[PDB]
Assembly symmetry: C3
Homo-oligomer: 203 residues x 3
């Protein structure tokens, strides 16, 4: 039947392998699919890897199901954005009168929501920058800095990350995107893991 997606540590006695959804459920403006996991670098929990995510800015983080998130991956939300229609210097931060120059919410750049799809593998130490969408089945190389969208079933890498090549032929990608195995009843997934693992699920 497989592991329990509501355990933060699905494997008894193992504090490195973590299910993301139950860890992040307390968080506003975050949605995470079942079974998506974090492979911890030093025992740290995955909530510590999500940076500058402030409810006031109303940006959303969404992660699909069956993702593999490598150790040290960080997700950067919009909270560190500076005002930039003029000086980026945050006079307001320093007070003694300068707090009158606090930016209005509509003066702060918002890059958008961050959306990671289903069955996505994010390599070790990748930085996901604000407003990025990563398509189902993508693979992001270790140490990438993702600043723009990545299409489904692409291998991508670098800083700035770029799409390197499609993982499979277009027909295969099309069929995978249509069938969406990640959305099947879990008992049906279980019956078909071998075929999900070798792509024969589309045959």
């Amino acid at each position: 039947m497989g592991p329990n997606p509501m355990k933060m540590y699905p494997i008894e006695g193992n504090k490195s392998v973590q299910f993301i959804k139950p860890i992040l459920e307390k968080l506003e403006n975050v949605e995470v699919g079942e079974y998506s996991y974090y492979d911890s670098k030093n025992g740290e929990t995955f909530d510590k890897q999500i940076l500058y995510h402030y409810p006031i800015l109303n940006d959303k983080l969404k992660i699909g199901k069956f993702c593999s998130i490598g150790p040290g991956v960080t997700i950067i939300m919009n909270g560190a954005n500076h005002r930039m229609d003029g000086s980026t210097y945050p006079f307001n931060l320093f007070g003694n009168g300068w707090e009158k120059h606090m930016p209005k919410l509509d003066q702060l750049p918002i890059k958008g929501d961050t959306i990671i799809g289903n069955d996505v593998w994010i390599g070790k130490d990748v930085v996901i920058m604000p407003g990025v969408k990563i398509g189902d089945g993508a693979i992001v190389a270790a140490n990438s800095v993702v600043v723009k969208d990545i299409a489904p079933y692409m291998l991508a890498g670098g800083n700035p990350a770029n799409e390197i090549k499609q993982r499979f032929d277009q027909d295969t990608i099309n069929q995978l995107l249509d069938i969406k195995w990640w959305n099947w009843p879990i008992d049906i997934i279980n019956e078909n893991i071998d075929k999900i693992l070798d792509n024969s699920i589309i045959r």
Copy 2:
């Protein structure tokens, strides 16, 4: 009027936000402008972020005023350069007779001084390599590795960093570079911060 730029920790209760000028006061061959700050990640002080800066090589670091330096930024001076007209292997390091092959001063590459302008925002974890000049008003993306110069009021990013686009039109940039608001006494700046923040200062 804002805080005193000579105060190491200008935000009350906060021992992470640091004015860099008073933090770096003890260091030779370092010139730093007022109001420029370091957004410490863990309370570490910005002097620990300046690497391989050795008086004998006589390279200089200069940082302008009103810069925003994100957490983890490192500035690499010339002290880790290897000799490269032949083997890069530093035989001299090992002593035991090999110290006679110490490079003479004019045998070591010096990439130049490092000069960061005024009103520059440098994102989290950026690495500034030896000899680079970054123009007034530039913005460097988080996780960039800056190996060549960045022109004024450019957005730049990547590893190696490249200019992405101009922040403002050329005429606006030209006017900002003429007016140099950062050089005004703070009691004059204080009367104009809103115009500095929205670029109408040029009018």
Copy 3:
């Protein structure tokens, strides 16, 4: 006659500078040349910097002689590769019945061996990804992520790392590749260090 290549710490009183060969000699499927050294970041030993190297995968790591490996360099062997003929999701990791879906050895991607040549300088915090070959006399810039081969006597840099330019003219490179000074008797090396350092060995 120079330092002792069998000392882990060849410099008395110094626990940072390390000779790599004696440290790694205990390791299966690793070969390292004499005098190649690691410039430790926090006192960590260089064995800690070789990641995911498992004898069962039978990938090999080779490093030549007289290499300079900067602080924080990591070498990534093949052991963290996900199966990717279909889903990259490691169902088997989680037990609870999914353990039956363990990948066969022949289902795990193998990028190849990692081979670093002689007289190679790898800069601070470089990541060497699986399967990469780096030719004799190459220089890899700090913070590079090396994903493909680097030719001999190339300057290379970036993420992904690309060749920037040849260090010397082609004839000089070919002469150095023929001479192989790193393979000379140690007494002959000692007689000629200044010429190895200024490249006049080619004459």
